[PDB]
Write a structure and sequence with these properties.
homotetramer, mainly beta, Lipocalin, 56% strand, oxidoreductase, Artificial Metalloenzyme
Chain lengths: 120, 120, 120, 120
Amino acid sequence: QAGITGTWYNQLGSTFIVTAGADGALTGTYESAVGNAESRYVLTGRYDSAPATDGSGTALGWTVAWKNNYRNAHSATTWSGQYVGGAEARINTQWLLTRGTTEANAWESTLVGHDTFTKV
Amino acid sequence: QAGITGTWYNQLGSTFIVTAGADGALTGTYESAVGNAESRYVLTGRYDSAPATDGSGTALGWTVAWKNNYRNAHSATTWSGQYVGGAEARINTQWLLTRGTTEANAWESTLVGHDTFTKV
Amino acid sequence: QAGITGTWYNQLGSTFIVTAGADGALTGTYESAVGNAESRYVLTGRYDSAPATDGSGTALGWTVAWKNNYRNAHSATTWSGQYVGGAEARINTQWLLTRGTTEANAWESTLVGHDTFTKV
Amino acid sequence: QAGITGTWYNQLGSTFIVTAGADGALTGTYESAVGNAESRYVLTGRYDSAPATDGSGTALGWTVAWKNNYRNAHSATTWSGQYVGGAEARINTQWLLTRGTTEANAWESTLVGHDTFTKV
């Protein structure tokens, strides 16, 4: 909970500001250093509030809808990954970015990638 | 908002109960008809509250952490897709399921699939 | 081998013409009914030539580089899925389409989707 | 073609031995440093033999069916990514691993990840 709460940065220089609730909630803001996006976007998600004690990571995910007071890309990213604690704590994610499309372009609606978040 | 709020079922017979907030919030419960899961799990997500008017779908996503009062799979799914309105309304998604793992099994942490939700 | 060899069509009306070799090879041509593509493109892949006998599908995959004598999209799709035999035989796939990009756009290089191939 | 042909290693210590044909063919062997696998497995794939000259990567992909003379995992991985030339040449991929399953487990058939291959 303390492990997760705070400010994370990924390999692109994006900024992930999250609070982890005792009830498994993730709340905060995301700022992308790339694409048609600016300023902060609301995020919400979930994480495993009672993780395995066997040295496994803590599963979590979250969503950003790329609508704020500045821009609307008509799109949503979800990140699915795990928090790894210790010396150099990481969130290792894979993400799906779905654009809103016509049924004609639905085949090309979704980008896939991977982001690694660190504290520094 | 009305379009999205309610009870959806996917091709597996899973049950997705969501409220769409005027502010872009998605809140509700998920019940999987498959895997090591039972009863309802909390979900949260986001959707584009001001979608394009050009016949495009409405981008959205959401997260479930597979922890409730019955089971803890130490895992999280995110669904990323779009709501398509009209006669037979659909949510078309792709999803990432991340297990918590040791760094040794991190390569095999994430399942990927696709779910289609309908109202019936 | 007989199961797989022949002409398949996906939900988009694309045409997948494949021969399965006794040695696990997949060879043929792909024709996309969508995107910046025309005519046939070479495909190669692999499949499990000795599948489980327990009613499981047969794992397989294949690649198309979107270069032929007509167009070069500077991109490659791989499909990963399984052949399901019987009355209505299917190839159920998920696919990754990677464009060639600058390191600046590498984050947006890859589309993800799902295709279902049938014989009809 | 020269750029691609040779021996690559990913972050797991797996060994990707490939020849790039003038006609866009990729042929070779894969050895996984992880999972239920041993020794070399046949791979085939495709790459863009006439890439953009604007500093973009070269799109490519390839398939391994996890059957050789030692083991049969009844599964196939496809890697989709791009070759980046220059000082520290890379193949940056995302991959889909499909197991053969019953229709009952088809939802959990596919793992997704990302591998980075370097020359050293």
